[PDB]
């Protein structure tokens, strides 16, 4: 099932800062930071990365439970913000949920944290 995810997309974002790609990613976890701001742990099958942030305009996808842990989504627009210390925050601007959490049911594959 890992062939369903854009393996290598997290490394490409973190090395190249590519924003043209439309990677297919699995949500591993979502958590609100305190009008909620959602931080996402995402997987591309090979790696996870925890510095994804949901743009406020996408909050309805969480509020209506379309975007939830274990779902698979395709990113259609995102921005990278590189911190002074070199870590990168990935702001998800537009996305489509391709397969619901219920339909997927579990983490895909055995991704390891990016470093």
């Amino acid at each position: 099932m890992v062939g369903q995810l854009s393996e290598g997309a997290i490394a490409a974002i973190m090395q190249k800062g590519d924003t043209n790609i439309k990677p297919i990613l699995q949500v591993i976890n979502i958590r609100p930071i305190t009008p909620p701001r959602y931080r996402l742990l995402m997987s591309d099958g090979l790696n996870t990365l925890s510095s994804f942030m949901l743009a406020t305009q996408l909050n309805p996808l969480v509020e209506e439970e379309q975007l939830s842990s274990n779902c698979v989504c395709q990113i259609h627009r995102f921005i990278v913000n590189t911190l002074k210390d070199g870590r990168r925050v990935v702001i998800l601007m537009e996305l489509e949920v391709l397969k619901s959490a219920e339909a997927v049911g579990v983490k895909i594959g055995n991704p390891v944290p990016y470093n």
Binding site: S50, T56, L83
Partner: peptide, 15 residues
């Protein structure tokens, strides 16, 4: 609370 670091604070300060 995965990755409970200072990235939360950065994302708060954004926008």
């Amino acid at each position: 609370d995965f990755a409970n670091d200072d990235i939360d604070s950065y994302m708060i300060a954004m926008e």
